[PDB]
């Protein structure tokens, strides 16, 4: 690849650039059954160990059958249970699985279930139309009903336990063991998985499924590669047990912006070394994280969580995300320039701290904590003094800061240093805002304005005063 | 249930109604035993397959037994696991085990009263003692190794991956899980446990029914391995409120629309997340996180709560009442958001940003203006705003549009606060009056300089 | 183990003394090898029941290849708060590793060093010098005890004992894989399938540090395995590689104090018209090389007993003058971390041995032991309760337990500091402020009154 890292002395910010998106735009579900026996608990006078194992077995299937049923009577959400933390305070709320569990209720009508045994009754891979005009691809992914009532209940229900032979118990087991799994899962996660395992789908499974979604070459391609990455994009959701089968939701991402290129922006605080003690003053660039150019606009995903990186691929989720006018970039050229707010916050607060970039550290040492870049083997090569620097990961193995040791990222790439003034150098600290949680540069000069402004007008009444 | 649902245009904000509370104010602790064998790493001559089988098994628990002890001694703060821990540390008094061993020498369920007065249910759900020293100790230990049966081989691994599998699970966890899987305590036991507790019959039926839930808000807490027993403390909800009124508050920005660059002032109630009615007051879950909700049913626990006085919900009926200060924040961020709410959406719509709803026939039902507004999930699939496209909840219910001024024209804009991270009316009340303040004692001055 | 805790009611928060460091100064990577079978679909025109059951569990292990061979081509690892806290790269060396083994030859490197024994260090060509462990071998398994089975055109009949000891051994390639599948190649913590007990305590004999360390780690090997991270590498040349990530605790058994803080609000008759601070310096306090390490985010760190695992890359390098924010709130060395406000809610903080309660408003704030009822109704302020006697406290309709941890507390009397604060001159939304910078735009406001009203004064 051609991974590039730049570094803007003035600003104490990088930006990673040369990575390719892959944006999760929308959702794709289908559904997942499970053939189950109707069957009953054993009437046999028994007394064998293999006939004692075949019973065991029969017993973990009937529980896990009714441990399902009771997760089917609540079967998807609230619009779940429960969600994760409330987005920061700029972005917006929305329901994940609201898709799937539409889908889910759809299932629980009555008589959708006979729609879909009915299109499964010849092919185990069909298109289903439900009532609400919906139509869903229908897999069954395991036939037990079919293996219990040919070969376990021909020697169970008799009164006298035909005696099985080790390699029916055996076999027994190892087709049980995924009911079982999925209904583990199930119950400890209340109806809803994330990621989906490779009970829930294997990986033969998931590729059909794959190949078979209304999407692109390119798109099936980047999907296929990058199988854990859908499997962690993906849920699982339990929806109905009935009528001797078990059909739960499953919700794969939809990656409909791809190839378009993505960068990433990491900050940290640009303070004034020239003074000693409290006398300094201090701002940090607010809009670190990842951006992707996205439909003449900018994607902006504030939160490293909802972004994830294989290589120089990014697999982003567009739900987390702001959309921004492409004149965002403008921060990285010109902070100041009239086309954008670019947006800054203030402080007073003079500490020393790293950042590990994509193929680089940007290091901010202030006071007299020790800042320093070294390698294994050569040892230290690079000494910070006060203010915001940098150094790039080729050569350097740890950079340590205070009694903090980071690793960097060997990730190798080209970076460029973008020598320039520190723009706190440009700000009369005696007028300067300095407890800005979120503000902008019109803001910041906003109120230097007003405050020199003020200084002016008062002076020149106390001097209109004789 | 009927669930509802109103939107304020006047503070940009839904609130949800017709939920059914249920929040944990106990904890119910049990003592979970497995009884095991003193047994040794066995002095048999083998060399035999399945004798080989059987010495890897016998390996496997007696590791998981070492890893065992190894483990058993090695809004505001709390820690959930008080009462749990109270009961383990009783278990690790000496005479205590035998107190146990014995309640349940006959029996599978009992109840014990330890020695600083607590009653427990307790319960043996593995003896793997029996099935080694009975089964599994007569043809090793010896001389030389008698053969097994193969369905010996097949039954000592059925029954020895239940502790392996809870060794596993304390082993990552610290000894400390949650949820509590099916491996520290299956469906059936779990269920038989909440029939057998001290407990209403509305509180049976509400643990009954919703199991996945009671298993997400317990413990399993690891407490000892002595005299041949495992032990440890599972720890359940007690829902001391059932059946209160529960209502969600969803909220997001609310802007001037109008009309050039960054010259708006916006306005954000803050108050968002779960409310419940609880003895007389409103306990607020603002980490909306923690609720859990199945069908109705809200199931919180109190220890992640705020109290507040019932005067709360004037804030959904008056944001200007005088009774409660409603709480606020203001700023001058003007970009488009969506709040995907109980059965409807929220739209924050601001700038070039093109705002639609959409049904999955109809194609685009809706285009929103440039301002706050909603819209239901009837005949509405998706909300796409910007390059983001949310699916809206499809639990159904009836959902009302509560018409109004937006406050934030109520505001002159150049004396707005538009800084506060947290405030409320009455801080940016003051705020105003103060700067229109200044501006007067100054005005006032100059006109008197004549 | 004395832990004895300090409640100053001047400042509204308590130390709690007492504990020891075990700091998580660096890393320690090692690589872990399976041995497996290159191993074609079997092909024995064969259906007895046993070879059914052989050629299903050669499925299995056939998928779980592939399923590696996916993870491998996609890689481990190819890559908050705003007290600065740093931002790093916690996979960065394990990473470094993988991207080593990735490299032409470096397989060979470990299959040569592995041949005479299970466990070699290996020099890899980038520098890098690992201990690698060979834990598995499914390969020699596979060729002797299974291939010729299988391999024959007609498949001669396996013993049952032959089926369960192939599911046996192909159980841990199994579950590897099914972890590494649904964690992008990287889990955390360590499971046993990953690295049992026994391994992850050799592979602890076998670090760089003092026996008091490794005494430390192989008591709390929960604690390692959740502080650890495994990360899938290459599958290639019959050869499983995944590296291990396991903390390095270069600083232990020094002085760690928690520091808990709570809003100081007015007590006074009317409304919102309050003013309240809090110190914002909560969190872990530990002696580290002349300074001290501080941890803001109390999340970041395990205790057990009165031992704190703490995360360097979590923590601030402070002075040691940051303590004497405990004894003098308003000592001119060091520059106290304060925040403020008008907000008037109750609220309650567990320390180590006892609880601070913040009641505010007309809330039920009180304090039990189970055998005696309430013990104490708390006025409105902030005041402290003692664990000696004091089983719950109750604010509002949330009851909270106390720590029942055996230690010695001091009430330390004083006046509430928010009472030396003019409540017209305060400034009263301060994100994050210092006593400084509150002192010095109260100074400020002041001149500004002063001037405003001198000078309309002098009209005459």
Not at 69 to 97: K, N
Not at 197 to 207: A, I, K
Not at 240 to 249: D, N, R, S, T, W
Not at 333 to 340: C, R
């Amino acid at each position: 690849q051609n991974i590039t890292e730049e570094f803007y002395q003035s600003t104490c910010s990088a930006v990673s650039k040369g990575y390719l998106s892959a944006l999760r735009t929308g959702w794709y579900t289908s559904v997942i059954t499970i053939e189950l026996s109707n069957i009953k608990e054993p009437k046999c006078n028994g007394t064998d160990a293999k006939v004692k194992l075949i019973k065991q077995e029969l017993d973990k299937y009937k529980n896990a059958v009714t441990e399902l049923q009771l997760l089917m009577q609540s079967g998807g959400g609230g619009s779940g249970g429960g969600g994760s933390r409330f987005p920061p305070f700029p972005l917006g709320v929305g329901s994940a699985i609201a898709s799937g569990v539409a889908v889910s209720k759809v299932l629980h009508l009555e008589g959708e279930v006979n729609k879909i045994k009915s299109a499964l009754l010849s092919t185990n891979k069909a298109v289903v139309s439900l009532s609400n005009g919906v139509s869903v691809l229908t897999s069954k992914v395991l036939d037990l009903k079919n293996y219990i009532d040919k070969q376990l209940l021909p020697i169970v229900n008799k009164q006298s336990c035909s005696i099985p032979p080790i390699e029916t118990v055996i076999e027994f087991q190892q087709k049980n063991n995924r009911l079982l799994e999925i209904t583990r899962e199930f119950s400890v996660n209340a109806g809803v998985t994330t990621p989906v395992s490779t009970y829930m789908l294997t990986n033969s499974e998931l590729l059909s499924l794959i190949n078979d979604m209304p999407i692109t070459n390119d798109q099936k391609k980047l999907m296929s590669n990058n199988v854990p990455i859908v499997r962690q994009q993906s849920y699982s959701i339990m929806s109905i047990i009935k009528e001797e089968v078990l059909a739960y939701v499953v919700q794969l991402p939809l990656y409909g912006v791809i190839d378009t290129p993505c960068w990433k922006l990491h900050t940290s605080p640009l303070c004034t070394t020239n003074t000693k003690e409290g006398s300094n003053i201090c701002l940090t660039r607010t809009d670190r994280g990842w951006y992707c150019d996205n439909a003449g606009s900018v994607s902006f995903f504030p939160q490293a969580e909802t972004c994830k990186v294989q290589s120089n691929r990014v697999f982003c989720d567009t739900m987390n995300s702001l959309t921004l006018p492409p004149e965002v970039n403008l921060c990285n050229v010109d902070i100041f320039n009239p086309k954008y707010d670019c947006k800054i916050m203030t402080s007073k607060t003079d500490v020393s701290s790293s950042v590990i970039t994509s193929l680089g550290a940007i290091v901010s040492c202030y006071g007299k904590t020790k800042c320093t870049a070294s390698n294994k083997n050569r040892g230290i090569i690079k000494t910070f003094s006060n203010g915001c620097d940098y150094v790039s990961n080729k050569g350097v193995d740890t950079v340590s800061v205070g009694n903090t040791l980071y690793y960097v990222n060997k990730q190798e790439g080209k970076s460029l240093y973008v020598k320039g003034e520190p723009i706190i150098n440009f700000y009369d600290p005696l007028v300067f805002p300095s407890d800005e949680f979120d503000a902008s540069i019109s803001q910041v000069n906003e109120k230097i304005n007003q405050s020199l402004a003020f200084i002016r007008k008062s002076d020149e009444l106390l001097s209109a005063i004789g």
